[PDB]
Design an enzyme around this catalytic site. Structure first.
Site, PDB file in Angstrom:
ATOM      1  N   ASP A 181       0.824  -1.200   0.000  1.00 55.70           N
ATOM      2  CA  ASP A 181       0.000   0.000   0.000  1.00 55.70           C
ATOM      3  C   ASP A 181       0.861   1.255   0.000  1.00 55.70           C
ATOM      4  O   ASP A 181       1.926   1.301   0.623  1.00 55.70           O
ATOM      5  CB  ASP A 181      -0.917   0.012   1.220  1.00 55.70           C
ATOM      6  N   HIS A 202      -1.292   4.505  -0.551  1.00 56.97           N
ATOM      7  CA  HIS A 202      -2.365   5.371  -0.062  1.00 56.97           C
ATOM      8  C   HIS A 202      -2.066   6.840  -0.353  1.00 56.97           C
ATOM      9  O   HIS A 202      -2.425   7.734   0.415  1.00 56.97           O
ATOM     10  CB  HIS A 202      -2.615   5.143   1.430  1.00 56.97           C
ATOM     11  N   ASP A 217      -4.333   0.121  -3.112  1.00 56.99           N
ATOM     12  CA  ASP A 217      -4.433   1.129  -2.060  1.00 56.99           C
ATOM     13  C   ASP A 217      -3.629   2.379  -2.418  1.00 56.99           C
ATOM     14  O   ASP A 217      -2.759   2.832  -1.674  1.00 56.99           O
ATOM     15  CB  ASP A 217      -3.985   0.556  -0.713  1.00 56.99           C
ATOM     16  N   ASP A 219      -7.495   6.885  -0.571  1.00 57.19           N
ATOM     17  CA  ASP A 219      -8.058   6.755   0.768  1.00 57.19           C
ATOM     18  C   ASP A 219      -7.003   6.985   1.842  1.00 57.19           C
ATOM     19  O   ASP A 219      -5.873   6.498   1.730  1.00 57.19           O
ATOM     20  CB  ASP A 219      -8.701   5.379   0.955  1.00 57.19           C
ATOM     21  N   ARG A 220      -7.378   7.715   2.892  1.00 54.77           N
ATOM     22  CA  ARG A 220      -6.485   7.999   4.014  1.00 54.77           C
ATOM     23  C   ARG A 220      -5.143   8.535   3.522  1.00 54.77           C
ATOM     24  O   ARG A 220      -4.076   8.050   3.906  1.00 54.77           O
ATOM     25  CB  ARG A 220      -6.292   6.755   4.882  1.00 54.77           C
ATOM     26  N   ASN A 240      -8.966  -3.022  -2.763  1.00 59.30           N
ATOM     27  CA  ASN A 240     -10.331  -2.988  -2.253  1.00 59.30           C
ATOM     28  C   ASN A 240     -10.857  -1.566  -2.168  1.00 59.30           C
ATOM     29  O   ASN A 240     -12.044  -1.326  -2.418  1.00 59.30           O
ATOM     30  CB  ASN A 240     -10.418  -3.638  -0.873  1.00 59.30           C
ATOM     31  N   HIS A 241     -10.000  -0.612  -1.819  1.00 57.16           N
ATOM     32  CA  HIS A 241     -10.403   0.784  -1.731  1.00 57.16           C
ATOM     33  C   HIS A 241     -10.466   1.461  -3.093  1.00 57.16           C
ATOM     34  O   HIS A 241     -10.588   2.689  -3.157  1.00 57.16           O
ATOM     35  CB  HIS A 241      -9.453   1.542  -0.800  1.00 57.16           C
ATOM     36  N   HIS A 272      -4.028  -8.026  -3.475  1.00 51.63           N
ATOM     37  CA  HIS A 272      -4.123  -6.976  -2.466  1.00 51.63           C
ATOM     38  C   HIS A 272      -4.945  -7.418  -1.259  1.00 51.63           C
ATOM     39  O   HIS A 272      -4.452  -7.419  -0.126  1.00 51.63           O
ATOM     40  CB  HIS A 272      -4.723  -5.713  -3.086  1.00 51.63           C
ATOM     41  N   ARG A 320     -14.832  -6.009   9.219  1.00 50.32           N
ATOM     42  CA  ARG A 320     -15.137  -4.926   8.292  1.00 50.32           C
ATOM     43  C   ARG A 320     -16.563  -4.988   7.762  1.00 50.32           C
ATOM     44  O   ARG A 320     -17.043  -3.991   7.215  1.00 50.32           O
ATOM     45  CB  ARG A 320     -14.159  -4.947   7.115  1.00 50.32           C
ATOM     46  N   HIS A 336      -2.395  -4.583   2.644  1.00 51.17           N
ATOM     47  CA  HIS A 336      -3.661  -3.957   3.029  1.00 51.17           C
ATOM     48  C   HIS A 336      -3.964  -4.031   4.521  1.00 51.17           C
ATOM     49  O   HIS A 336      -4.989  -3.482   4.942  1.00 51.17           O
ATOM     50  CB  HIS A 336      -4.853  -4.562   2.268  1.00 51.17           C
TER      51      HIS A 336
END
Lengths: 35, 308, 431, 581
Positions: free
Chosen positions: B56, B58, B84, B87-88, B116-117, B166, B213, B240
């Site tokens: 990741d 991000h 990833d 996000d964030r 996934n994000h 991932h 989750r 992840h």
């Protein structure tokens, strides 16, 4: 008064998503002072 | 001729070295080239070793450039990522733009997967939509990048011996023909084998479990080694999930979790390892602390200029 | 005793006010004219004193907006916690303001000039032929009608992990502070990217949490003295001369705890809520949940005066625990000459004591009994069951009309009392 | 013909910030086109009071108005730029006010004495007697430009106005006055200086704030540089002595940061007699920033002491303070002291150096904190040129060898950057008999930046050692380094070849190294094929046809048939690099 064990329900059934820590710290340092 | 296009792209690369804002036509043409390249690729991108693996990011640009310095400059050393990219994070746009640019310039010497994000609802809610609104003021860039995300291969088969993805595994997955049977031109679902594949995490807890989750599952070790024996696999790399140590060995060394984003969410202050596929498939890690931020942190115990 | 006389009232009449109408601060300004009231939602509403006159509305401007966090993805809010004014640099007046995360610096200014003159367009903007122009003309200025207009100039953001509950301009026109629940940053009024963390009482790990910071001030004359309070009863008196990092106290004002009235709640009705220096720089009144208590700057180990606000509540203190009416941040303000002090209370009463004659009153800010230029007579609550026609039995006080926020005109004798949805401005009778 | 100007004159009335900014910048063309008997009466009155509040519009407008001395009509009508600048000198901002004041000073030189006394002095008096505390803050900086050319009565009035400003209420005005005190005093009569500025300096150095008392130090420096040396003991010195023992650490830090200039001003006699105790007190201060600042000037101070007793004082008064500071608890103090401790070596004769400076050196090297070793190493030249490092090499070697290997590669990168200077200052046989082991490991290091630095340092050494040393040392090791499994280590040999061919010579490269490169060309990894193509492309400019067409051309032709795209592209690039068009 002395029966605060039940009134502890407040801090018991709370799910604070980081609100101010004054109200949490008060009821969290309130019971540990006696229990 | 391709020469003029290559020189123009190199000039834009130097411009990115200057940290300059871009226009629209450039990103639209880059996205069109990326989609043209990507529509012919299947869910399982074939990456040939040797290669440098990273998890990741991000959207942290500074950690990415530090990674570039440690691992060498492209295309001298091959690279790979595991999703990833949003996000964030604060600098998603620069991350994705540089990724696409380097991919187009070096199509076959770099690979990028999906995460996934990389889902429409998730990307819309987690910064990316706000980031695009701040940098362009319109949602066209959001649509373009979601279209690009749709085509991204889900999994990577490294030299036919190592498999990297991932999210995680799914109960319904036994062989890769399941992944190749999916239609990657869809929004990330909430249920189904693909979701659990992209939304699952390893479970040290014995047996199966419910994913906290609320989307996916928690694959046990039994299915992992069954998959390995059936397809003759040794390790299954993943990412992840945050680890304070950068990487951990769990499930009897069967799973190695790679995180390339030190201080994920800028709070945990974790290490970041990159598990390089050596020429002979061995695993080497080059751990790096959070990258020194330029002119930072803003809040310091040291006296600033105005006070001194 | 200055007999107080109703003068005005703002807000509506219907008692179903939405959440974005609860007044959440009231602050006069240095010279006396203006008066800001930043209710929830952000909608600061500035009142100007009619050139005594009454207060008519001057401007209005949504200050803060409902934001949303990225990483913690929280419902970062839009309340207005504090509204501090700045001194007067020119015909414009500035004022900070803060929700739980940000600090903006607005600027209110009048304007009575409009450009009059066009070159390629008509008076309505309808453009003429491009080339027919022969003599250029430059726009002229001509008067219009006053149009007050606010606009943010800087935004100090993203430095506080916890919520903000204080600001204070430093006594040298340059800097100020902003104290969150555990740290105190010292910003600069012209540098909107760096801060300087000046105090930190956060422990190594979080689970051993004892006290937090519930207020912070500065000194009205000294440039190197803040007084940040503490959620156990103590009051440090920091000093930014002896060391760059002011973490260690230079004094510690702490009542030598009285073991007589020790009770079950002996730590939750003794947590300071607002410390306020004394307009000259000598006393430092502070208001916990049950008594304003005037410290002195040269005598650490004891206060010099203690005024019990609503003593009739130390019995109901038990019943005050199940409706969350025991966590309430009351607020106290000084006179203009350090002789009278005011503080809010329940059921719309607001006690105002008197330092030099030791008297005290209890007025009532309400609507259905008062008209302009009448007099407010002292309401006197009764604790016992003997109640005769001029007292309220404590079983009848409405514990939902709290006069939290209050102010007091710097020089003159006008006060502003902000109940849940109004802004009564009781002055005294000029004779 | 005036259409673009017609558009531009109305474009400074729109709502787009960029449009108004561009129109403001281009105002020069509009002014030129309008004329000279129309500009003053039409354009300036329109810019007199503008409602633009953007910092980037008012700033540009002020900077433009600062360069209108000609279009307005000439040096005879320059007093027409005052109404539109006095309105910017009193805006809420700070940079805008500074720019407006600077422009006012710049255009003040175009007035004439009579014109000055008639139209500019009234502006100053006005701003310095205004109502807002911004008119006064901006006025506090226009005295040093209009004092010299005015009459005596105007001079006295200006002095009175400044003295009134220095006793203002708002700390901002007093800060401005303290800032401009020295600049104003530099133009006053000497007797008037002594009798009028000194009281102002004292009253501003005994202030109740501290943002004023800290600027009083710079005011003191300027005043001391102004007055003769027969009065410093009665006019300036008491204030400096008071400031050196102030209560607010900011004032003491400011005094410490201004110590070399203070010494140069006060002179050698007063320096030696009084400043040294103040310097010792500053070093032994309870704060940390004060200690760091006072240590930063350890060398510059000791270097300017009197030659009569420099060595004595240094060894009798200052040495113990440095000895104590060496083992300090803070990090900035230690780093700052280490970075400059090397200037004290050439002040003794190397005898006192070996006697007492050596220990401190070892303590600093043995320090377990980073950047202290880096600073101590980087300036070794001093003792090298004073004690002859060959003597101390026995101690340097353990420290350098322990610093070469660490965890984070940052220290590893800063010391590899510092390596070439020490390599050049050490020797040949000593280097080869010892640090040769180190050199080899450096090339096979993990982090790639260290590989870059090692290759660059090799290049620097072989450029300082020429051909024979390299041929007798690295040639075989680097050549054999081409068998490692990790393709990165083989590419490292490739970059080493590229960087070392031009220094080792074609007579040896093509004869021994090249055939290996041609062998590497057939690596089973494309990452190397195109690297060996780039290397061929890099050595071609020094390669002729005799060997080129014989060996290189077949290799590029074979590469151009590879499956990979980059290999073919880079082989083609080389093919064209052969100046063949």
């Amino acid at each position: 008064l002395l029966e605060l064990a039940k009134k502890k329900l407040k801090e018991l059934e709370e799910e604070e998503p980081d609100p101010d820590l004054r109200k949490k710290t008060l009821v969290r340092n309130m019971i540990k002072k006696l229990e | 001729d391709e020469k003029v296009f290559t020189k123009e792209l190199d000039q834009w690369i130097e411009q990115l070295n200057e940290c300059k804002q871009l226009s629209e036509s450039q990103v639209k043409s880059l996205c069109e080239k990326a989609k043209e390249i990507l529509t012919k690729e299947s869910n399982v991108q074939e990456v040939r070793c040797p290669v440098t693996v990273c998890g990741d990011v991000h959207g942290q640009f500074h950690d990415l450039m530090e990674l570039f310095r440690i691992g060498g400059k492209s295309p001298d050393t091959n690279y790979l990522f595991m999703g990833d990219y949003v996000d964030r994070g604060y600098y998603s746009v620069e991350t994705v733009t540089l990724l696409v640019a380097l991919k187009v310039r070096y199509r076959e010497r770099i690979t990028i997967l999906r995460g996934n994000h990389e889902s429409r609802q998730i990307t819309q809610v987690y910064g990316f939509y706000d980031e695009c609104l701040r940098k362009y003021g319109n949602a066209n860039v959001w649509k373009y990048f979601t279209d690009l995300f749709d085509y991204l291969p889900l999994t990577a088969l490294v030299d036919g011996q190592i498999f990297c993805l991932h999210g995680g595994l799914s109960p319904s997955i036994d062989t890769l023909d399941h992944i190749r049977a999916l239609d990657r031109l869809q929004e990330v679902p909430h249920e189904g084998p693909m979701c659990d594949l992209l939304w699952s995490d390893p479970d040290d807890r014995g047996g199966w479990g419910i994913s906290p989750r609320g989307a996916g599952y928690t694959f046990g070790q039994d299915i992992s080694e069954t998959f390995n024996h059936a397809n003759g696999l040794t390790l299954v790399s993943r990412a992840h999930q945050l680890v304070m140590e950068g990487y951990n060995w769990c499930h009897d060394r069967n799973v190695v979790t790679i995180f390339s984003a030190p201080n994920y969410c800028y709070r945990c202050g974790n290490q970041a390892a990159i598990m390089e596929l050596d020429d002979t498939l061995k695993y080497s890690f080059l751990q790096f602390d959070p990258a020194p931020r330029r002119g930072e942190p803003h809040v310091t115990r040291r006296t600033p200029d105005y006070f001194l | 005793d200055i007999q107080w006389c109703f003068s005005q009232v703002k807000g509506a009449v219907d008692d179903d006010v939405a959440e974005a109408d609860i007044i959440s601060t009231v602050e006069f300004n240095h010279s006396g004219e203006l008066l800001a009231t930043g209710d929830k939602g952000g909608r600061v509403v500035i009142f100007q004193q009619e050139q005594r006159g009454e207060y008519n509305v001057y401007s209005t401007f949504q200050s803060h907006e409902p934001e949303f966090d990225y990483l913690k993805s929280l419902e970062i809010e839009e309340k207005i916690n504090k509204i501090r004014w700045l001194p007067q640099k020119n015909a414009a007046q500035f004022l900070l303001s803060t929700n739980d995360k940000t600090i903006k610096l607005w600027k209110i200014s009048e304007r009575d000039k409009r450009p009059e003159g066009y070159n390629l367009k008509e008076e309505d903007g309808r453009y003429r032929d491009p080339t027919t122009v022969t003599t250029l003309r430059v726009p002229v200025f001509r008067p219009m009608d006053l149009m007050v207009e606010a606009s943010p100039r800087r935004i100090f953001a993203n430095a506080h992990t916890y919520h903000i509950n204080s600001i204070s301009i430093n006594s040298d026109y340059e800097t100020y502070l902003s104290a969150d629940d555990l740290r105190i940053n010292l910003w600069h009024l012209e540098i909107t990217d760096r801060s300087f963390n000046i105090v930190d009482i956060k422990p190594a790990n979080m689970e051993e949490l004892t006290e937090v910071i519930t207020a912070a001030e500065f000194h009205p004359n000294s440039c190197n003295t803040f007084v940040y309070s503490s959620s156990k009863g103590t009051i440090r008196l920091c000093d930014m001369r002896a060391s760059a990092l002011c973490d260690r106290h230079s004094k510690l004002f702490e009542e030598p705890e009285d073991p007589s009235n020790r009770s079950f709640f002996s730590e939750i009705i003794s947590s300071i809520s607002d410390v306020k220096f004394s307009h000259s720089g000598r006393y430092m009144m502070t208001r916990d949940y049950l008594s304003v208590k005037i410290w002195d700057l040269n005598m650490e180990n004891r206060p010099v005066e203690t005024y019990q606000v609503h003593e009739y509540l130390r019995s109901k203190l038990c019943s005050l625990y199940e409706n969350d009416c025991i966590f309430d941040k009351f607020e106290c303000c000084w006179n203009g000459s350090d002789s009278v002090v005011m503080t809010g209370s329940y059921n719309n009463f607001f006690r105002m004591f008197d330092r030099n004659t030791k008297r005290d009153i209890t007025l009532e800010a309400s609507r259905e009994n008062n008209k302009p230029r009448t007099v407010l007579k002292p309401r006197k609550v009764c604790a016992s069951g003997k109640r005769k026609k001029d007292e309220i039995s404590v079983d009848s006080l409405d514990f939902n009309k709290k006069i939290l926020h209050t102010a007091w005109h710097p020089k003159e004798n006008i006060i502003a009392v902000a109940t849940t949805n109004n802004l009564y401005i009781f002055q005294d009778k000029v004779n | 013909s005036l259409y673009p100007i017609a558009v531009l004159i109305d474009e400074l009335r729109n709502e787009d910030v960029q449009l108004r900014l561009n129109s403001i910048k281009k105002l020069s063309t509009i002014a030129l086109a309008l004329g000279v008997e129309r500009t003053r009466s039409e354009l300036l009155p329109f810019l007199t009071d503008t409602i633009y509040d953007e910092d980037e519009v008012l700033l540009a407008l002020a900077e433009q108005l600062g360069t209108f001395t000609t279009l307005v009509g000439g040096p005879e009508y320059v007093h027409c730029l005052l109404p539109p600048l006095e309105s910017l000198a009193t805006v809420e901002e700070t940079v805008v006010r500074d720019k407006a004041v600077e422009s006012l000073r710049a255009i003040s030189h175009e007035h004439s004495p009579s014109d000055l006394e008639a139209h500019f002095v009234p502006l100053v008096k006005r701003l310095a007697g205004g109502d807002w505390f911004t008119s006064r803050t901006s006025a506090c900086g226009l005295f040093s430009v209009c004092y010299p050319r005015v009459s005596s009565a105007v001079k006295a009035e200006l002095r009175q106005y400044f003295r009134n400003l220095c006793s203002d209420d708002t700390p901002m005005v007093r800060r401005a006055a303290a800032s401009k005190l020295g600049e104003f005093a530099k133009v006053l009569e000497l007797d008037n200086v002594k009798s009028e500025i000194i009281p102002m300096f004292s009253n501003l150095a005994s202030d109740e704030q501290d943002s004023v008392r800290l600027l009083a130090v710079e005011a003191c420096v300027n005043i001391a540089q102004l007055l003769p040396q027969e009065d410093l003991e009665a006019l300036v010195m008491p204030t400096l002595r008071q400031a050196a023992e102030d209560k607010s650490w900011r004032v003491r830090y400011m005094v410490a940061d201004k110590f070399t200039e203070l010494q140069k001003a006060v002179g050698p006699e007063i320096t030696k007699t009084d400043l040294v105790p103040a310097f010792q007190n500053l070093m032994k201060d309870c704060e940390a920033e004060v200690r760091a600042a006072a240590s930063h000037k350890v060398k510059e101070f000791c270097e300017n002491l009197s030659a009569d007793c420099r060595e004595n004082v240094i060894m009798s008064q200052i040495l113990p303070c440095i000895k104590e500071l060496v083992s300090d608890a803070n990090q900035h103090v230690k780093s700052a002291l280490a970075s400059v401790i090397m200037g004290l070596s050439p002040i003794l004769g190397k005898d006192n150096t070996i006697e007492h400076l050596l220990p401190l050196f070892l303590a600093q090297l043995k320090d377990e904190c980073p950047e202290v070793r880096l600073n101590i190493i980087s300036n070794l030249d001093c003792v090298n040129e004073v004690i002859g490092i060959r003597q101390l090499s026995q101690s340097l070697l353990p420290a350098i060898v322990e610093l070469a290997e660490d965890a984070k590669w940052r220290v590893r990168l800063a010391i590899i950057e510092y390596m070439p200077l020490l390599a050049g200052q050490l020797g040949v046989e000593f280097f080869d008999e010892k640090l040769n082991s180190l050199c080899m490991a450096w090339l096979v290091d993990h982090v790639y930046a260290i590989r870059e630095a090692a290759t660059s340092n090799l290049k620097k050494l072989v450029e300082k050692f020429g051909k024979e040393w390299a041929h007798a040392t690295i040639i075989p090791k680097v050549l054999a380094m081409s068998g490692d499994p990790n393709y990165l280590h083989r590419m490292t040999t490739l970059f080493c070849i590229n960087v070392l061919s031009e220094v080792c010579g074609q007579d040896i490269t093509t004869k021994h190294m090249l055939p290996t490169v041609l062998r590497m060309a057939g690596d089973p990894v494309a990452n190397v094929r195109f690297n060996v193509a780039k290397s061929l492309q890099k050595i071609g400019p020094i390669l002729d046809n005799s060997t080129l067409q014989s060996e290189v051309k077949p290799i590029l032709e074979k590469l151009t048939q590879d499956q990979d795209v980059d290999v073919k592209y880079f082989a083609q690039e080389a093919l064209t690099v052969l100046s063949l068009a």
